Structure 1
Amino acid sequence: KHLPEPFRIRVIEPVKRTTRAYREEAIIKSGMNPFLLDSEDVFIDLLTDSGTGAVTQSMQAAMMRGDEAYSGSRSYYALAESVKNIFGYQYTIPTHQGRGAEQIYIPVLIKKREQEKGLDRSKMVAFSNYTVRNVYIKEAFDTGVRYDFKGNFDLEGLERGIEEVGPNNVPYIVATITSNSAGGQPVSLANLKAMYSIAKKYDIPVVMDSARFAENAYFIKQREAEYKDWTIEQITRETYKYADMLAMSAKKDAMVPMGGLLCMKDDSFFDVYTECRTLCVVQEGLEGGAMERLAVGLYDGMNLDWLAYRIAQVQYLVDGLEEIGVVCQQAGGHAAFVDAGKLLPHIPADQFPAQALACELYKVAGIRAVEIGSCPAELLRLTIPRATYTQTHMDFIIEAFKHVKENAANIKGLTFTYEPKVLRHFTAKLKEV
């Protein structure tokens, strides 16, 4: 069941209404790739939830108070300072997105090692619950074994892959939270701890990748026995003792439209922080009010009632769709991968099911989701933008997904009428087979 929203709506952005008549000129002119579709034509946009969700009034006021100093920025203090209280790292380097924080730490952490341990470039390899090589447990992808912390570190797997390497050629460990395998599964503190030690020994750096830190917190609280009674920050603080440094995209749990963070725990890492400052000068990051905001989203992203709500309703949508037996090739907190061949068995791989599915939803409700499938299987993917849509929204979606599945029969398929050299799915244009 869907929980009632633990807030009041104060500011809304209008969406017009669409006769299926109209919704077709549209998808036609889109040339059947909904990406290439005007929003403002999309009724319910499901294309992604990365900073496309709502904000709190404090977040808004925050944006009014930017001090746009280009140094010693009192705003920057605030941002880095809420980082110290929330995560207790003292080394905040605002980036402007997630992708930011990586483009900076990869090349440094590599070099730190290539030097004081003498790593070998062409035979180097990084590890991760989710080149990296992903060391996740066996339950991981077993939709239909209820394991509570599904994206944990395979401690042993990792152990092995380290010397299988061995220590001098692993620059770091990323520990994504929540883990990003299988539409987003939690990682336990006990596991987090565990894994961290497996690094202390071979002395490797541990980079906590936390776009969904708040959610992961909640799962630990909902589920790890011995925490059931810690608050979200309490959890989160403790959590962060098991990494040296954190790299996040604020556009998720932090609740802001723009923003990235790359930060460091203590001066045992000031050494590194020093070199990212050096690197960051040539590239990447942010408006002063941006910082004031993110400084707040950080605390706002963690309110319990909210996360409970947020996760509630992602859940609710999925329960909603199994109830009408729509196949999901995985379901979690990040996304929802409906399976399209199953929902649409009589349309081949080179006729494209996902696009086709995508367009129908579109015609029928005006939902915009996304062929993520091409070759393993053909998936069409859902995500939900925080504090943006309702249960009625969810209902409309679900229901729309019925009508699809009933006309599953005379819904057609697609064959290229233009396709660019790389990344076909972003601007290709299709027709049926």
Structure 2
Amino acid sequence: KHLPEPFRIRVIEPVKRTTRAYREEAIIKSGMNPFLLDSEDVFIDLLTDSGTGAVTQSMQAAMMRGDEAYSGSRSYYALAESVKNIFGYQYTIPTHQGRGAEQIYIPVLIKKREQEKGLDRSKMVAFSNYFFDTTQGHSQINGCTVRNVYIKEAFDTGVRYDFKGNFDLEGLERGIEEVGPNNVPYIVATITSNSAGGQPVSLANLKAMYSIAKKYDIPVVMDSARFAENAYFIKQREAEYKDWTIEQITRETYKYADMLAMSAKKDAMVPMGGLLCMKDDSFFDVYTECRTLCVVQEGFPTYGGLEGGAMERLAVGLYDGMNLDWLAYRIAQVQYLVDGLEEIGVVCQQAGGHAAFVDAGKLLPHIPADQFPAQALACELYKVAGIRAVEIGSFLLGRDPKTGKQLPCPAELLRLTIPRATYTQTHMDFIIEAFKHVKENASNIKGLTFTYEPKVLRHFTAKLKE
């Protein structure tokens, strides 16, 4: 059952509606890419949960007392203190958002292994249970190839597994041995594997992975956008921690990484914000190296592109986002949507933490991956009810930066991303109802093809036809 909101709605933002005819015109005008649609032409925007959710009174209140100092802001220290208490990390660098931190640590870490272990940029490879679109982008832009070492169950939308976000431990080890440990600049642990469908990573898996990393002295970066939801799943599924608090599980979790890069725009519940933090003194050097690069890419390292109030707000969000009643509610809503879709015959990845992932591949078997079936489905859904979603399949995966050919994709998923505390059960029902029509028209949905394709992170602004 969809749990009742453990909160009262305090502030609302009105939204309008549109006609089918209008959407038809609009979706064409947008080159068949929802990313290019106007906000006001969307009734229920499930494009992403990043910076689109609601905030709590405490957070809005925090936003009112920021120290806008350019250097040494007390708001910075407030944020730093929250990081020290929650993750146990001593060094903090705020960034405006996720890719803000990535564009800093990646270059820094690469140069490090180069200068220390003779890493060869022409043969370097980074690993992750699964890289973010932007993490992969910045890695490749820095001449580093990536390899996602996910488990066999990860993308089997027909089978259930407790931690589909887990690292393929053997795979990771053989991968490192092959590539050569000196050529692996870092390993990124994505807490709640986004591409796997917001699937959790067990604490045991993290310990094992970190153990392998320690062995080859490879820096481990914990991508923490949805650390809270991951902590929740660990608490519900990993026996050892059934009776631990989200805070305790989080603290434990972060003992298995050397630093964290986070897009606070998710679980921390803020409309803007990111973090780049190092656990301890052993990484003091990368810390000061990141402060140097931060000045260039984001701003002085005591605000790094965030206004004072934004840091006070984040200092609070990191806590509010860990509330157990909240997490149970949020995740239960997603479960509700997934079960609703599954009951009308729309197969999905098992319910994850932030969104329902519809298996476009299974729903539209006639359109080849090369033709982006999940993107076609997205346009169909929008047409139908004014709901906007994103594809997590071949369109997003991109082409091989070396071959120039379309990368093979493990699954063509349509992601119905649910912004935190933004929509109600009625909206969920509305979405499910919409899919009844989408399904009833599956067989007639046409594949898509480029008319304009950017060279980097193409899915955000590309346009397609047919």
> Would you call these one fold, judging by a TM-score over 0.5?
yes
Cα displacement (A) at 1:180: 2.9
Please say if residues 54 and 422 of structure 2, whose CA atoms lie closer than 8 Å, have aligned partners that are also in contact: yes
Measure the CA separation in 1 of the matches of 2:443 and 2:147.
Answer: 41
Cα deviation digits, residues 169-224 of structure 1 (max 9, x gap)? 22222111012342121111122112212222222211111111001000111111
Give the CA deviation at 1:418: 7.0
Q: Residues 200 and 26 from structure 1, CA distance in 2 versus in 1: closer, same or farther, beyond 3 angstroms?
A: closer
Structure 1 pair 138/63, CA: closer, same or farther in 2 (3 Å)?
same
Q: Distance in 1 between matches of 2:147 and 2:115?
A: 23
Instruction: Name the % identity.
Output: 100
Tell me by how many angstroms 1:372 deviates: 4.6
Shift in CA distance, 27/206, structure 1 to aligned 2, threshold 3 Å: closer
Closer, same or farther: CA 9–160 of 1 in aligned 2, 3 Å: same
Q: Deviations over 1:48-79 (max 9, x none)?
A: 11111111111101110111011110000000
Taking structure 2 as the reference length, what is the TM-score of the superposition? 0.85
Does the C-alpha gap of structure 1 residues 314 and 418 become closer, same or farther in structure 2, counting only changes over 3 Å?
same
Cα distance change, pair 327–273 in 1 and its aligned pair in 2 (3 A): same
Question: Structure 1 residue 4: deviation in Å?
Answer: 1.0
CA root-mean-square deviation: 2.6
Structure 1 Cα separation of the partners of residues 196 and 357 of structure 2: 9
> SS of the counterpart of 2:17?
coil
Structure 1 window deviating more from structure 2 (276-285 vs 240-249): it is 276-285
Distance, in Å, in 2 between the alignment partners of 1:408 and 1:174 is 37
Q: Which has the higher mean CA deviation after the structures are superposed, 402-411 or 8-17?
A: 402-411
**Using a 3 Å threshold, how does the CA distance of structure 1 residues 265 and 418 change in structure 2: closer, same or farther?**
closer
The question of whether the paired residues in 1 share the 8 Å contact of 2:169 and 2:209 is answered with: yes
The aligned residue for residue 431 of structure 1 is 465
CA contact (8 A) 1:330 1:338 kept: no
Most deviating of 359-368 and 318-327: 359-368
How many angstroms apart in 2 are the aligned matches of 1:406 and 1:28? 22
1:344–1:13: structure 2 CA closer, same or farther, 3 Å change rule? Answer: same
Distance 2:184 2:452 in 1: 43
Aligned-pair CA distance for 1:414: 6.2
Distance 1:5 1:379, change over 3 A: same
Q: Is the 8 A contact 2:331 2:352 kept in 1?
A: no
Contact 1:264 1:273 (8 Å CA) reproduced: yes
Contact in 2 for aligned 1:310/1:387 (Cα 8 Å): yes
Change over 3 Å in CA distance of 1:73–1:228 after alignment to 2: same
CA contact (8 A) 1:420 1:428 kept: yes
Which segment is superposed worse, 417-426 or 168-177? 417-426
Q: 1:223 to 1:22 in 2, by over 3 A?
A: same
- Between 307-316 and 354-363, the greater mean CA deviation after superposition: 354-363
Secondary structure of the residue aligned to 1:330 is coil
Deviates more, 1:311-320 or 1:173-182: 173-182
Q: CA deviation at 1:15?
A: 0.7
Compute the displacement of 1:351 (Å): 7.6
Check whether the contact 2:158–2:349 (CA below 8 A) recurs between aligned residues.
no
Q: More deviation in 306-315 or 133-142?
A: 133-142
| Paired residues of 2:197 and 2:352 also in contact (CA < 8 A) | yes
- Number of residues of Structure 1 aligned to a counterpart in Structure 2: 432
Q: Deviations over 1:81-126 (max 9, x none)?
A: 1000000101000011111111111111122221222222212222
> CA 1:180–1:429 in structure 2 vs 1: closer, same or farther (change >3 Å)?
closer
Q: Deviations over 1:269-328 (max 9, x none)?
A: 112111111121222121111100111110011001111111111111111111111133
Note closer, same or farther for the CA distance 1:350–1:168 as it changes in structure 2 (3 Å cut): closer
Relative to structure 1, is the Cα distance of residues 197 and 33 closer, same or farther in structure 2, using a 3 angstrom cutoff? closer
Question: For residues 404 and 167 of structure 1, do their structure 2 counterparts lie closer, same or farther at Cα, with a shift above 3 Å needed?
Answer: closer
Structure 2 Cα separation of the partners of residues 127 and 420 of structure 1: 25
Q: Please tell me whether the aligned partners of residues 53 and 388 of structure 1 are also in contact (alpha carbons under 8 angstroms).
A: yes
The answer (yes or no) to whether the contact 1:127–1:173 under 8 Å persists in 2 is: yes
Q: Would the aligned equivalents of 2:355 and 2:417 in 1 still touch at CA under 8 Å?
A: yes
1:328 is paired with a residue whose SS is coil
Task: Quickly say closer, same or farther: Cα 1:370–1:205, change in 2 above 3 A.
Answer: closer
User: CA 1:360–1:295 in 2, change beyond 3 Å: closer, same or farther?
Assistant: same
1 CA distance for matches of 2:369 and 2:236?
A: 41
Tell me the CA shift for residue 25 of structure 1.
4.6
* Cα distance, 1:379 vs structure 2: 4.2
CA distance in 2, matches of 1:341, 1:4: 33
Aligned to 1:276: 290
Contact 2:372 2:393 in 1 (8 A): no
Shift of 1:159: 2.3
Q: Assess, with a 3 A threshold, how the Cα gap between structure 1 residues 420 and 93 changes in structure 2: closer, same or farther.
A: closer
After superposing the two structures, state which structure 1 stretch, 167-176 or 355-364, moved more: 355-364
TM-score where L is the length of structure 1: 0.91
- Are the counterparts in 2 of residues 182 and 331 from structure 1 also a CA contact under 8 Å? no
Deviates more, 1:49-58 or 1:103-112: 103-112
Query: Against the structure 1 CA distance between its residues 181 and 363, is the aligned structure 2 distance closer, same or farther, given a 3 Å change threshold?
Result: closer
Secondary structure in structure 2 of the residue aligned to 1:359: helix
Indicate the SS of the match to 2:256: coil
Cα distance change, pair 36–317 in 1 and its aligned pair in 2 (3 A):
same
Structure 2: 5+ residue stretches without partners: 131-144, 299-304, 395-408
Q: Which runs of 5+ in 1 are unaligned?
A: none
